[PDB]
Structure formats: structure tokens, C-alpha cells
Write a structure and sequence with these properties.
The structure is a homodimer.
Chain A (H helix, E strand, L loop, with lengths): L3 E7 L3 H9 L4 H4 L3 E9 L5 E10 L2 E10 L5 E9 L2 E12 L5 E11 L5 H26 L1
Antiparallel strand pairs in A: 1-7, 2-3, 3-4, 4-5, 5-6, 6-7
Protein name (chain A): Cyclase/dehydrase
Pfam family, one (chain A): Polyketide_cyc
Organism (chain A): Mycolicibacterium smegmatis (strain ATCC 700084 / mc(2)155) (Mycobacterium smegmatis)
Chain lengths: 145, 146
């Protein structure tokens, strides 16, 4: 079980969506499956380079220690360093402008689990995570608009 | 949250104690309340520079992210960067050889808790943690010695 992807159109500008995806410590305010987030380290330009995320994995609480990379202007790439449940979690956000106030958010999620869970079930659970993330982001956009 | 200290004489060489204390990922094997420990980053010489420590108490999990320093050749100094319940946790291990086969372990622990727990109560709990580690290290030494 491995890479799943989700594209969703959001009713906000590309810079607003990039700001939401980049405001990691505000994740618990609008994402139900992230209960806490702490910036552990920052690059020399101040951008967060390492995070702690308190997450809910199928209802279990879990802790992720994650590295953050910035491939391009409207792109964010996170890489799990050590976490509960998963041996690998690589997530790429790509923010593609549509119109002045509309944006395509494209999310790739790349996971490997510690327990020998069957392939289709891993991709189903990762797809559900992206489905919920998109709905949570929609709510955050409406709250700020 | 004033600093608490513990000195214990251990019946093992300095190289044995240094190896036990430095083997961070083996901590769960001899500490019952530590469920996991992972090296997150290393210095350029390979020595770990950052750790994740998972503790469990009454089935309740806690996670600590700590930086590791080597201030002197016989010293290991850890500084909590972010953890549950604590705003500060600075712990220093100093390993000094005594006789041909025993060594002195010096541990200082300086903690701050998030809740407004009174100072004297924090230091009492920190002192209990050090006894607790000292007894656990004693067991690990006996388990690892001939």
C-alpha cells in the first residue's frame, strides 16, 4: 500500500491557501485529526524545519516528528522522521492558482506502516486521511472568508 | 524546580557505564516506564544530537524531544526541546573512574513543569526519578557484567 493523491478546489487565493498549509501551529484550530503541533526547529530564514504533531490515527492518539522542506514558492513537502504507526509518511502540498480567489490544492501522501497491513487497506486509510484533510481545509477557508 | 543531584558508586568500569548511558535506543530494555527511544539526528561524528523519548505511566503516554550535548569527554548533557508536562528538563551525566573496576556516576537534573506545581514538590519528584534511574542502572550493570 502506498502513494495516494487528492486534488480539491478551494475558494481562496493561492497565497491564502499556502499561508494556511504553512501555519503548522494553527493546524489544531481547524484540523480535527491534528490535536497539537509544535515547531521544533527553524531554518536560517525562520521557516519551520521540524515539527511535532499530535495526531489521531483511526482514533488512536499518535505523535509524529516531521521534517519540513520547501521545494518551490507554492509547495510544501513534509517527511516523517519518527512516528507512531508509520515507518514512512511523505506528504507534498502543491498550491496551483486557478482564478484570483480560487485555488487547486494537490496533495500527495506517501506512507508505509509498521504492522504488515495489506496494501489496499493502507491506501484506503491514507485516502480517507486526504478526504478529511480536504474537508477540514474547506471549513478553514470559509471561516477566514 | 531547583536542581537535584545524585551520586552513586557503580560496580562497573567507566567504559561500561559510558556505553550504557550513551546507548539511548537501548533505554527501554532496562527502564520499565520508557517504551521507546529513537535517535533523530547526529553530529558530524555520528554521536546522537537529538532524541525522541516515549514514556508511559499508568498507560498514559508522554513524548519528549531532547537535544544531546557532549560538553566534556566524560559528560553527557541533555536539554528538553519540547515535551509533555515539562517546559525545561536539563540532565547531566558525569562518569569518573574510581578504582580498577568501579566508577562514580554524577547526575544533575534541573526541571520545570508546565502546571504551577510548587518548587519543593517538583524537586521531590525529580529526586525520586533519579533514585529510580540509579536503581535501574544498577540492574542494567548487573545484567551486563560477567
Amino acid at each position: 500500500g502506498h502513494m495516494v493523491s487528492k486534488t480539491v478546489e478551494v475558494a481562496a487565493s493561492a497565497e491564502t491557501i499556502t499561508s494556511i498549509v504553512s501555519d503548522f501551529e494553527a493546524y489544531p484550530q481547524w484540523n480535527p485529526e491534528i490535536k497539537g503541533c509544535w515547531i521544533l526547529a527553524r531554518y536560517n530564514d525562520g521557516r519551520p524545519s521540524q515539527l511535532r504533531l499530535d495526531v489521531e490515527i483511526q482514533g488512536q492518539s499518535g505523535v509524529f516528528i516531521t521534517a519540513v522542506y520547501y521545494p518551490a514558492e507554492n509547495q510544501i513537502f513534509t517527511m516523517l522522521q519518527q512516528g507512531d504507526h508509520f515507518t514512512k509518511q511523505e506528504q507534498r502540498f502543491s498550491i496551483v492558482p486557478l482564478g484570483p480567489d480560487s485555488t487547486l490544492l494537490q496533495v500527495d501522501l506517501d506512507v508505509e506502516v509498521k504492522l504488515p497491513v495489506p496494501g489496499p487497506m493502507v491506501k484506503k486509510l491514507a485516502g480517507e486521511t486526504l478526504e478529511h484533510l480536504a474537508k477540514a481545509l474547506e471549513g478553514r477557508v470559509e471561516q477566514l472568508t
